[PDB]
Design a protein around this ligand. Structure first.
Ligand code: MG
Ligand code: MG
Ligand code: MG
Ligand code: MG
Ligand code: MG
Ligand code: MG
Ligand code: MG
Ligand code: MG
Ligand code: MG
Ligand code: MG
Ligand code: MG
Ligand code: MG
Ligand code: MG
Ligand code: MG
Ligand code: MG
Lengths: 216, 121, 25, 96, 129, 97, 206, 81, 87
RNA sequence: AGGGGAUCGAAGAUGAUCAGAUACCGUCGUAGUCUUAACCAUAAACUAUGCCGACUAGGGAUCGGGUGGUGUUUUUUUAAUGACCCACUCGGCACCUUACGAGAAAUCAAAGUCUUUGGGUUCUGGGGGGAGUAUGGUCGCAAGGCUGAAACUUAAAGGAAUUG
RNA sequence: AAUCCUGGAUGGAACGACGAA
């Protein structure tokens, strides 16, 4: 059993919320990964690298292993989670949890000629974390993902088919490359474009609609 | 030293939290009911608990104690909490207001008494 | 070593070389 | 203004600044002074034939301990001496 | 010193709209600023604006919406030929679907799609998106 | 790196301050990097004042005071149990006790 | 709009000007506060009590909009507002938090003080900056009782008052509860005075 | 403050601001017509005059300069124009 | 946006701040959705009849949400002389 | 090069300390320290932050000038002044708080408005050493300065923070 | 009913360790 302790978790278990789009539209904070594996059961995890990190002591070095995990269904959503732990398996478990918590959506778009089923990104995007800038440029069909392996895997798990890249900085720090790519694709919906100028009526929150079947 | 530990202190605080209208300031009777009302493995720990309950009751009999809240205490607290005067000091005793407050009231367009007192540096 | 004193050593050696070359020139 | 001039009639400044900052490199300098040709016991060729003079038992650098079985070689075209290495197990017994 | 005024104008606009301000005051009100803002207005990137006539150079007060991410200027005003246009746009626009590079031609100041339609080219000024 | 924005001192707009000498080690330290204290004291002490008043003609007198301004270098001020040493966050505390 | 029955009454003006709510802080003035009316000599400012009333009524509308009133939260770590918030919580649902806030009460779902509110109400944001900070992490609006030097960052509706005073805080809380109940329908008479006294929501040193 | 009208500001603020940093810069100085005792023959005088202005009929004196506004001689009557 | 033949794509058409018309992202957790109750003829509030107002973490952090909400409220009519355009 | 040369004092001499101490400490003490006329042309000459210009968050204090106020005090109760107070303003040395931002970080209201990369302009740098060396010029009475390599050598030197 | 008061310091000697990891 799950036994949620959250308004949102209670609503999800009661079945009122059937899509993560409402969560995203109301900017709701997720705290239970059960929500995400309920809404998006069809995602896949992937561990990029395990690197050990050490802390010096009176008596040698306690080494605990760091783990970088990327989750995604290949239609429009991904997450990234980093976790340190004494044992690799616990790192990977809790990193899968964190990755599901950090799930965000993607604005796929067209390179031009809006023919069918977006394949690229709608805009150029950059992301920075550390020295590392990572740029994502839109690309035509068939180009595939012109990028490094790890970033390619992140984008494949996002559902991007064709995209170009430009990096700069010590890209050999994979944590920072992936955080940069993650920010770069998160800013897609942060970017405003003329197909989003039109005003909407500001819908109401489920926390205000189904509040009775919430907390108690 | 003679410092007592959190086991003792927490247990004593619970015993006082829910058995105040009971045990008094004497270690012997407090011991002889604490062994009855709580199950404890060791006579030594029992006596330590009883001593601290006695000390806390000594504290309580002259003023209250932070962290403690038993039924009699909270009842007296709320009984004092609902105190109200029959004058309700906001009610008028005769009101003063500077000229700035005066023409504030004027700009708001209201009927009020004003015993204007001038305030200067 | 200290860069100041290394500099002082170069200056002395320059002086040395300058005069031992003036011996011929 | 990010330093460098940006005006539309300032190409000369940029040209010369490039030239000097190219001299700051290693490849450009090595290429234009001709160190391959004036020095560097070859003439910038890939290989060279030379005449053995002696065999050598050069000791390795730390952290390591070995004797590396080199040879002194006098090039035919330059006459320059160079120490050269004989790579394999037991191949010094062919360079008499 | 004060070299190009369009640059200061557009920097002011960008800083204002970064801060979220629905208005900004521009100085000192070049003709080219007016036609630039006319283009951005026509494509819906700012809104109204009002030219204040002091007898010196003018001021402009520009009402803003959040539709504009970046208005910039290219200094120097490079000369641009009719394939160099697509080169430029590919370099400094986010996508092929929106955004306008602005460039003075002999046929007035205007945007690059309009320039493609008139088959004319010129000197780049800036860009907007 | 930069331990302090004031860098040690109170030189903003000056260039040069024309130093002074530490009264303990005679070191030429600038007047702004120094540490100025003022030892305002009674001339005698808390103890012998009673004996002095007892043995004094001219009663009610004053017990005048000795005022001397002290400059110390950093090293001597730190040796003499003055401004000693602080944490990175409390270095910014600029007021006295 | 409003039916004009909500406009300021001279009785409420008497209450406010007796409690000296109008007397704001000194010429220290945060430029996010145009609520001022004609700064006084003595280096003191006077507050537009009409604007105070309007903001208070707006706050009460927002509080009444909540379906489940226990999702509203009142904070006051100041000594001068604990009784006020507790009486507010008595006459409304309004799960209160008086005294210490216990960092991780809006986050940290396993914590025992774990509230999941739809709104929070704060006596002084400076003294309760932890609560508004935590609200920023978790998508919560904030109502506050401000003076004219307060840090209004991460603050939605702000009620200009004299938070330095004992009577101002309790008066504002009392009026807020009054308006909220009038909007919910418990108090059917709008012009009626609501028999509860304002000195109930006050601080007492013993 | 994120919204305001910079075209229709308050006269209080515009008098509070520096003469150059208003919407349309202009002078905060002014002119006067002054009566000297005796010779009426009113004389036109600037606020920030820089000169010891004096009436043409009798050199009495009308103002003495300062770093800003001039100081009018005490026996005089000024009217703002 | 949308493809060659209507048929809307671009899941998650997002919200826009009522004070800046900047998009509110999924992780903008300082973003808030103020809901203001309506009233009808008596003084009482209607349940389920809200005036909505979204605000973004930027506006809230910079301290301007109060003023933004004031001006929005007066443009929607539920307030009076508090806010002024000409400062 | 003249003058002046009280103090302190590179050198040097001595007393000690020390395993040694031509170092620290002590006592002397020349040149210098001051000046005039003329050379030098350097420095952690540092804000280790080029100049011009625009814009972008709050807050108060302060230096100079200016404006206003039936404001306070002193004159001759009184005027004009001057010194203070309040409000405001231009310009300056700076400061405090926060980060919307920037940055590798330490930190920065500039080190921001820079992959959403272009306001204008000058200078400098391109792994560490060798080496600011050699040579050649040029300036200088000299001391030295400005200019300034290569051979050879090496996989790390280094910056900022972390826990020990 | 008498009744005057305080805050504050130094203090000698103590060289060195093959590299590898
Ligand atoms: Mg690279
Ligand atoms: Mg040009
Ligand atoms: Mg200096
Ligand atoms: Mg130099
Ligand atoms: Mg330098
Ligand atoms: Mg500047
Ligand atoms: Mg001034
Ligand atoms: Mg100033
Ligand atoms: Mg200055
Ligand atoms: Mg290089
Ligand atoms: Mg090098
Ligand atoms: Mg090696
Ligand atoms: Mg270091
Ligand atoms: Mg030895
Ligand atoms: Mg040795």
């Amino acid at each position: 059993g799950w036994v949620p302790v959250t308004k949102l978790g209670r609503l999800v278990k009661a079945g009122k919320i059937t899509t993560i789009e409402e969560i995203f539209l109301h900017s709701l904070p997720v705290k239970e990964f059960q929500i995400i594996d309920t809404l998006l059961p069809g995602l896949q995890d992937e561990v990029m690298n395990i690197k050990p990190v050490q802390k010096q002591t009176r008596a040698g070095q306690r080494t605990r292993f760091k783990a970088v995990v990327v989750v995604g269904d290949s239609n429009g959503h991904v997450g990234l989670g980093i976790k340190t732990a004494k044992e690799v398996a616990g790192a990977i478990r809790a990193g899968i949890i964190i990755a599901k918590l950090s799930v965000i959506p993607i604005r796929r778009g067209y390179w031009g000629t809006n023919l069918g089923q977006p394949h690229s990104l709608a805009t150029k995007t950059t992301g920075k974390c550390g020295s590392v800038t990572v740029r994502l440029i839109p690309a035509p069909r068939g180009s595939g993902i012109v990028a490094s392996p790890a970033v390619k895997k992140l984008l494949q798990l996002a559902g991007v088919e064709d995209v170009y890249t430009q990096s700069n900085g010590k890209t050999r720090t994979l944590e920072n490359t992936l955080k940069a790519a993650f920010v770069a694709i998160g800013n897609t919906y942060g970017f405003l474009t003329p197909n989003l100028w039109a005003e909407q009526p500001l819908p109401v929150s489920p926390l205000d609609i189904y509040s009775d079947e919430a907390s108690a | 030293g003679r410092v007592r530990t959190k086991t003792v202190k927490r247990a004593s605080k619970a015993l006082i939290e829910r058995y105040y209208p009971k045990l008094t300031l004497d270690f012997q009777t407090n011991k002889r009911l604490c062994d009855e009302i709580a199950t404890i493995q060791s006579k030594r720990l029992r006596n330590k608990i009883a001593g601290y309950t006695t000390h806390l009751m000594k504290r309580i009999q002259k003023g209250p104690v932070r962290g403690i809240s038993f039924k009699l205490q909270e009842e007296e607290r709320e009984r004092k909490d609902q105190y109200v005067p029959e004058v309700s000091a906001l009610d008028l005793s005769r009101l003063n207001v500077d000229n700035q407050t005066s023409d504030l009231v004027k700009s708001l367009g209201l009927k009020l008494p004003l015993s204007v007192i001038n305030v200067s540096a | 070593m200290r860069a100041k004193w290394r500099k002082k050593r170069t200056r002395r050696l320059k002086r040395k070389r300058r005069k031992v070359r003036a011996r011929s020139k | 203004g990010k330093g460098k001039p940006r005006g539309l009639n300032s190409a000369r400044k940029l040209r010369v600044h490039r030239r000097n900052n190219r001299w700051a490199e290693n490849n450009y300098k090595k290429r234009l002074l001709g160190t391959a040709f004036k020095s560097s016991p070859f003439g910038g060729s890939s290989h060279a034939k030379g005449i053995v003079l002696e065999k050598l038992g050069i000791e390795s650098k730390q952290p390591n301990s070995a004797i590396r079985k080199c040879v002194r070689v006098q090039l035919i075209k330059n006459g320059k001496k160079v120490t050269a290495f004989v790579p394999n197990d037991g191949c010094l017994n062919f360079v008499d | 010193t004060r070299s190009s005024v369009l640059a200061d104008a557009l920097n002011a606009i960008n800083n204002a709209e970064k801060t979220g301000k629905r208005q900004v005051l521009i100085r000192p009100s070049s003709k080219v600023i007016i036609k630039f803002l006319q283009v951005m207005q026509k494509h819906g990137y700012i809104g109204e604006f009002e030219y204040i006539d002091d007898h010196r150079s003018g001021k402009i007060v520009v009402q803003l919406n959040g539709r504009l991410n970046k208005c910039g200027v290219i200094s120097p005003r490079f000369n641009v030929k009719i394939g160099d246009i697509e080169k430029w746009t590919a370099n400094l626009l986010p996508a092929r679907q929106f955004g306008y590079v602005i460039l003075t031609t002999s046929a007035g100041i205007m945007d690059h799609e309009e320039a493609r339609r008139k088959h004319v080219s010129g000197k780049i000024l800036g860009f907007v998106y | 790196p930069k331990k302090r924005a004031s860098n040690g001192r109170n030189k903003k707009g000056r260039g040069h301050v024309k130093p002074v000498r530490c009264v303990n080690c005679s070191k030429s330290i600038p007047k702004d990097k120094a540490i100025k204290r003022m030892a305002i004291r009674n001339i005698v002490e808390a103890a012998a004042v009673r004996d002095l008043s007892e043995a004094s003609v001219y009663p009610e007198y004053a017990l005048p005071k000795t005022y001397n301004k002290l400059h110390y270098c950093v090293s001597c001020a730190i040796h003499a149990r003055i401004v000693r040493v602080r944490s990175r966050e409390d270095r910014k505390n600029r007021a006295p006790p | 709009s409003l039916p004009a029955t909500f406009d300021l009454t001279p009785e409420d003006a008497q209450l406010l000007l007796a409690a000296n709510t109008h007397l704001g802080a000194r010429n220290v003035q945060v430029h996010q506060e145009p609520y001022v009316f004609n700064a006084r000599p003595d280096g003191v400012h006077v507050i537009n009590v009409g604007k105070t009333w309007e903001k208070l009524v707006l706050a009460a509308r927002i509080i009444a909009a909540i379906p489940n009133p226990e999702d509203v939260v009142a904070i006051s770590s100041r000594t001068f507002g604990q009784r006020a918030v507790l009486k507010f919580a008595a006459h409304t649902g309004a799960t209160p938090i008086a005294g210490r806030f216990t960092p991780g009460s809006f986050t940290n779902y396993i914590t025992r003080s774990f509230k999941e509110p739809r709104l929070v109400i704060v006596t002084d944001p400076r003294s309760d900056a932890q609560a508004i900070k935590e609200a920023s992490y978790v998508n919560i609006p904030v109502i506050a009782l401000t003076d004219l030097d307060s840090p209004s960052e991460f603050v939605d509706v702000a009620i200009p008052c004299n938070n330095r005073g004992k009577h101002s805080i309790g008066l504002i809380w009392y009026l807020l509860a009054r308006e909220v109940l009038r909007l919910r329908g418990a108090l059917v008479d709008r012009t009626q005075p609501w028999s509860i006294m304002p000195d109930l929501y006050f601080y007492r040193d013993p | 403050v994120l919204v305001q009208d910079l075209l229709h500001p308050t006269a209080a603020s515009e008098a509070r601001k520096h003469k150059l940093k208003t919407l349309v810069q202009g002078p905060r100085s002014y002119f006067l017509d002054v009566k000297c005792p005796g010779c009426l023959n009113i004389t036109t005088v600037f606020s920030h005059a820089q000169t010891a202005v004096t009436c043409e009929s009798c050199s009495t004196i009308l103002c003495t300069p300062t770093g800003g506004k001039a100081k009018l001689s005490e026996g005089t009557s000024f009217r703002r124009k | 946006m949308e493809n060659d033949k209507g048929q809307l794509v671009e899941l998650y058409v997002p919200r826009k701040c009522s004070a800046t018309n900047r998009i509110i992202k999924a992780d903008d957790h300082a973003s808030v959705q103020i809901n203001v109750a309506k009233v009808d003829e008596e003084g009482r509030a209607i349940p389920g009849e809200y005036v909505t107002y979204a605000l973004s973490g930027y506006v809230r952090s910079r301290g301007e949400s109060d003023d933004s909400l004031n001006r929005l409220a007066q443009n929607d009519g539920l307030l009076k002389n508090v806010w002024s355009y000409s400062r």
